Design an enzyme around this catalytic site. Structure first.
Site, PDB file in Angstrom:
ATOM      1  N   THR A  98       0.818  -1.206   0.000  1.00 29.75           N
ATOM      2  CA  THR A  98       0.000   0.000   0.000  1.00 29.75           C
ATOM      3  C   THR A  98       0.861   1.269   0.000  1.00 29.75           C
ATOM      4  O   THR A  98       0.564   2.242  -0.703  1.00 29.75           O
ATOM      5  CB  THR A  98      -0.894   0.041   1.269  1.00 29.75           C
ATOM      6  OG1 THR A  98      -1.565  -1.216   1.444  1.00 29.75           O
ATOM      7  CG2 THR A  98      -1.911   1.143   1.160  1.00 29.75           C
ATOM      8  N   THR A  99       1.923   1.249   0.800  1.00 31.55           N
ATOM      9  CA  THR A  99       2.784   2.413   0.949  1.00 31.55           C
ATOM     10  C   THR A  99       3.525   2.669  -0.362  1.00 31.55           C
ATOM     11  O   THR A  99       3.887   3.803  -0.668  1.00 31.55           O
ATOM     12  CB  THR A  99       3.763   2.243   2.127  1.00 31.55           C
ATOM     13  OG1 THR A  99       3.025   1.937   3.322  1.00 31.55           O
ATOM     14  CG2 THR A  99       4.582   3.527   2.364  1.00 31.55           C
TER      15      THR A  99
ATOM     16  N   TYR B  33     -12.592  -4.263  -1.499  1.00 31.19           N
ATOM     17  CA  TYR B  33     -13.746  -3.885  -2.307  1.00 31.19           C
ATOM     18  C   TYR B  33     -14.832  -4.953  -2.501  1.00 31.19           C
ATOM     19  O   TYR B  33     -16.010  -4.637  -2.366  1.00 31.19           O
ATOM     20  CB  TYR B  33     -13.322  -3.293  -3.661  1.00 31.19           C
ATOM     21  CG  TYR B  33     -14.494  -2.874  -4.508  1.00 31.19           C
ATOM     22  CD1 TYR B  33     -15.271  -1.777  -4.157  1.00 31.19           C
ATOM     23  CD2 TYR B  33     -14.830  -3.573  -5.652  1.00 31.19           C
ATOM     24  CE1 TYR B  33     -16.356  -1.393  -4.921  1.00 31.19           C
ATOM     25  CE2 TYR B  33     -15.910  -3.196  -6.425  1.00 31.19           C
ATOM     26  CZ  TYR B  33     -16.671  -2.108  -6.054  1.00 31.19           C
ATOM     27  OH  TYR B  33     -17.743  -1.741  -6.832  1.00 31.19           O
TER      28      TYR B  33
ATOM     29  N   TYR C 256      -2.290 -10.107   5.462  1.00 23.94           N
ATOM     30  CA  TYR C 256      -2.287  -8.690   5.768  1.00 23.94           C
ATOM     31  C   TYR C 256      -3.735  -8.268   5.939  1.00 23.94           C
ATOM     32  O   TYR C 256      -4.504  -8.275   4.976  1.00 23.94           O
ATOM     33  CB  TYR C 256      -1.602  -7.938   4.626  1.00 23.94           C
ATOM     34  CG  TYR C 256      -1.629  -6.433   4.718  1.00 23.94           C
ATOM     35  CD1 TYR C 256      -1.885  -5.781   5.919  1.00 23.94           C
ATOM     36  CD2 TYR C 256      -1.396  -5.662   3.591  1.00 23.94           C
ATOM     37  CE1 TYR C 256      -1.914  -4.402   5.988  1.00 23.94           C
ATOM     38  CE2 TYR C 256      -1.425  -4.286   3.647  1.00 23.94           C
ATOM     39  CZ  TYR C 256      -1.680  -3.660   4.843  1.00 23.94           C
ATOM     40  OH  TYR C 256      -1.701  -2.285   4.886  1.00 23.94           O
TER      41      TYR C 256
ATOM     42  N   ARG D  18      -9.073  -0.097   4.873  1.00 21.81           N
ATOM     43  CA  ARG D  18      -8.866   0.038   3.437  1.00 21.81           C
ATOM     44  C   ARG D  18      -9.623  -1.003   2.618  1.00 21.81           C
ATOM     45  O   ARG D  18     -10.085  -0.709   1.520  1.00 21.81           O
ATOM     46  CB  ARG D  18      -7.377  -0.036   3.093  1.00 21.81           C
ATOM     47  CG  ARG D  18      -6.588   1.151   3.580  1.00 21.81           C
ATOM     48  CD  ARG D  18      -5.117   1.021   3.253  1.00 21.81           C
ATOM     49  NE  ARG D  18      -4.426   2.262   3.576  1.00 21.81           N
ATOM     50  CZ  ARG D  18      -4.332   3.293   2.745  1.00 21.81           C
ATOM     51  NH1 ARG D  18      -4.877   3.218   1.536  1.00 21.81           N
ATOM     52  NH2 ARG D  18      -3.701   4.401   3.122  1.00 21.81           N
TER      53      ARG D  18
ATOM     54  N   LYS E 181       0.029  -9.498   9.204  1.00 23.23           N
ATOM     55  CA  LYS E 181       0.303  -8.089   9.472  1.00 23.23           C
ATOM     56  C   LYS E 181      -1.006  -7.503   9.816  1.00 23.23           C
ATOM     57  O   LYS E 181      -1.953  -7.575   8.978  1.00 23.23           O
ATOM     58  CB  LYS E 181       0.920  -7.466   8.251  1.00 23.23           C
ATOM     59  CG  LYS E 181       1.168  -5.996   8.362  1.00 23.23           C
ATOM     60  CD  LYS E 181       1.413  -5.398   6.986  1.00 23.23           C
ATOM     61  CE  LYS E 181       1.528  -3.889   6.963  1.00 23.23           C
ATOM     62  NZ  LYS E 181       1.440  -3.402   5.586  1.00 23.23           N
TER      63      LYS E 181
ATOM     64  N   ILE F 109       5.939  -4.047   9.960  1.00 23.83           N
ATOM     65  CA  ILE F 109       6.032  -3.597   8.586  1.00 23.83           C
ATOM     66  C   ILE F 109       5.614  -2.134   8.627  1.00 23.83           C
ATOM     67  O   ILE F 109       4.434  -1.801   8.803  1.00 23.83           O
ATOM     68  CB  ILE F 109       5.174  -4.453   7.646  1.00 23.83           C
ATOM     69  CG1 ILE F 109       5.790  -5.848   7.552  1.00 23.83           C
ATOM     70  CG2 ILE F 109       5.102  -3.828   6.260  1.00 23.83           C
ATOM     71  CD1 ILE F 109       4.892  -6.893   6.917  1.00 23.83           C
TER      72      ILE F 109
END
Lengths: 297, 298, 298, 297
Positions: A46-47, A110, A136, A141, A165, A206
């Site tokens: 994502t980052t 989504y 994760y 999100r 995570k 992370i």
């Protein structure tokens, strides 16, 4: 146990310059993480703006981390998740081919699969490669939660799934996880609460902050693993202000802003729909940054 | 900020009823059981003690019983004394002080949703009216409001006798925020499942529901933590997770009183409406979790 | 004949204070203004009337004044009389009937989080204690609990005088749920911004905050909708949207009391702690929005 | 002023058979919609499992919708959106080339852009095609919210943005939207609350339920649009049970199950991470279905 990737890890930002991925900057930034005690890097999470990279750029980013970590004890935990299982399997297979040490695989966003769907999704992924898979969870999100029961079943049923995570602001869940299945690797995906997660038996982070302050995040993590909780908490407390300001707008907007202010990347550039922060938030980030010693190259 | 404080392993005491009447004999007996099992403070007439349905005279009586029973011991009395009306919260604090409580626990105003300015004025007025320690109590799921970190720190700094906050908000981030910016306050866990994480971040106590039933385990956990023996503290916290969650399968104190009844520790499974017995299903779930635990008798 | 109900355009009355005391003359004058502006019922001592911080004696005074002022008019008094203690809610209900109230509005128990079984028994006790209409009041953001659709419907069906519910829950799905499964009940809007959609789905009235300031607009809205004049009801709902939102920029009744003072309708901007004046910023925000509306005088 | 697509509209399911898109079934399902009063069809939206379709399957679905709607007054509002603006733009043009009348474009999921980013996202989409664009807000799936201010600004600045599909369970927001900009087309994306949205000036629905009960959804909408609120509400009330049960698990798990149970498709298959609902939910859906008259072919 299983084969694992733990310790202090960084979710790498992806610098752009004139729309194009700056691959020289990307390699340089990884070397900087490496020199500052980081145990593993996470390309294209994502980052790293996974959403807006092409498939080729995604693969290239993994290749660069792999090539750059060669000759060091640092590992590559490649971002390889998707909300389509066939694509997630594909990305996992590529990551394994380009020599990644393991994969980080976000919960489908989504489309909101059920717990049964999540189970089959990750089971399919784990069966496709013989390398470690870290789940994760980030419901803010994704719009879905991988439950503790599903995480635990996945860990117990699939040889290569070794942990999760967590980016969910839920320390109760963190207790639940490690009380029922203490063999798993719980990884902090939420910088402000790195210490509490580690102090409960979490085995790594992370991190977003570590892009800017890798020496501090690695020291924090390593103290906690050495059970020097006093020192770990001290750094965690110290980092609270920057850990929060790095989320004043959606990550990675603030962290790219910080990295730019620090002279670490050349262009404060995103790919739409991400974009520059508000002037207010830009000013807050720059101000918080003044309290910290930022490692150069 | 020095302040006088009440910290350590504390129990939010249930209030037993027998035929509608507060069973004061049972109440004193329950407190002695807490004392003998290493507890550091008791909290009469908090949420767990059904504060909402006691009369004022019962409220005073319960505080009085706690103070008298804890005489001759190190165990402190942190009296429930909050209200959503500032004048009443002040009156309650004053009562608690006159009856000899060591401190008061003062819940954020419920239902009427005061602004942060109002919360500050509320607590400042309470704090100014008595010279005994005041512990703030944040529980947004019950009150409909949140005392912000900034409001908590301001109160702690501006009022000498305000010494910390009991947090029941499932928010370990806020716990970090609190103690990173103001490491002199006493953060107290008001949420049993996460006692260890709060204490390991510098929390200095718990006000526990679970300790009604297992005071010896909650006391040992807390004291292990305070001694920086985190391995042992976490071990107990992990072991307790199952009982910790099932005690909230319906609204507290419905499950804990059910467990106390099942253990033969109180005589009657009685509440005052609108609280009532659990479903038969939850009754059996509580009973079966208890079986994994060694429950101290009298 | 007809089932006994209180519906139409209703006002949750603010309780004006002068130098710390209920301003009774102001109170009567404010109710008179509601009456003259098409209101069908007034609600003394609700959330908006700062029920939490009023004494029992003040609760009485407000109800009596309401009863006396509406006397000889068609306007009814739906008195606030709820509590999180059932024994108190019963007493308050009987207290309200005895002082001449036409019916009662009884909020879901705040803070102690009764289960649905508890809520059922709570409200059943209340309904059996008096012979006047009882309107349930669901506002989970304030109480910490929800009266489920199932519980509301069973209460409506099992108790004669429970005729409906005031919903302040920002949940139009539930409003469809309620009137689809039990179309005989009176669903009352407790959320000004969404008065029209609730009414357009078959709701039969509102208990309004905004009507304190703009009673003529709220009553006209309600009556247009009751008359199936949905275009006109919507038109008013749309133009009231801004004032409806700004009256909640801080916790109600902080904004509505500010607006009434600003309009010159009350003479003192006084609250009881923990409630207090709005920020300078919100004060000016409120003062601005008001400029867009024609505010009736006395 | 502003070309629009409104009325009773169906978010089409995508039947799979042996893992592949059942093209004949897809066409037959659309004909059934047409014959039952529907005003527009939405191929490859959320309900059509957009996430797990290929570009080619995406093309195929739109082409089948366009071809099947030819010669009717029924329009094709194509799903064309992404959380990467460059892709979203590409999909929009790609939908136009294949004959779509308009596009439905969902708010970027997972990467959580800011309102500024959302504005730039949609402006780039709007300026890349000359067909109507309908925004789609669904925060529970995307993790972000297009604010009322942002929607109104896009509506006013960009010629072809004509409205928004709301799936947010927030009638307050619907009031706010139509009070400040009554010229926009608010479209219901939440079947249970179709009637309240329409009665506040909403001008259509993009329905899940209309897959199973198209005749009922179309009548509800047309009654409402004709200001026969009594009849529109009556139907909304009757549909409430089915409207809720169709979300007992994430859409489109229940609706595709119901269609199979009804005999309207010949296989029940999803693409992972989606899967069949639990056995008990199969039963629940079946019981609720028995209360309705389900049109055949």
């Amino acid at each position: 146990d299983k084969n694992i990737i733990i310790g202090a890890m960084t979710a790498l930002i992806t610098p752009f310059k004139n729309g194009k991925v700056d691959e020289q900057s990307y390699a340089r930034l990884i070397k900087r993480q490496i020199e500052n005690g980081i145990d593993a890097v996470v390309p294209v999470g994502t980052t790293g703006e996974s959403a807006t990279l092409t498939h080729e750029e995604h693969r290239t980013c993994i290749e660069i981390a792999v090539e750059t970590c060669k000759g060091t004890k640092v590992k590559v935990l490649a971002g390889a998740g998707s909300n389509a299982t066939h694509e997630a399997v594909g990305l996992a297979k590529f990551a394994k081919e380009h020599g990644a040490d393991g994969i980080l695989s976000v919960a489908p966003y989504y489309n909101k699969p059920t717990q049964q769907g999540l189970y089959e999704h990750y089971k399919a992924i784990a069966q496709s490669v013989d390398i470690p898979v870290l789940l994760y969870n980030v419901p803010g999100r994704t719009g879905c939660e991988i439950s503790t029961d599903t995480i635990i079943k996945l860990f117990r049923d699939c040889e290569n799934i070794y942990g999760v995570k967590e980016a969910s602001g839920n320390i109760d869940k963190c207790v639940d996880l490690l009380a029922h299945e203490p063999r798993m690797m719980l990884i902090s995906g939420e910088d402000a609460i790195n210490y509490p997660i580690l102090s409960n038996g979490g085995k790594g982070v992370i991190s977003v902050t570590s892009n800017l302050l890798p020496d501090m995040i690695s020291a924090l993590t390593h103290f906690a693993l050495d059970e020097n909780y006093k020192e770990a908490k001290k750094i965690n407390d110290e980092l609270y202000n920057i850990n929060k300001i790095l989320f004043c707008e959606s990550n990675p907007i603030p962290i790219k802003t910080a990295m730019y202010l620090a002279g670490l990347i050349e262009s404060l550039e995103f790919r739409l729909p991400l974009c520059s922060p508000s002037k207010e938030n830009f000013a807050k980030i720059e101000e918080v940054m003044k309290k910290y010693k930022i490692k150069g190259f």
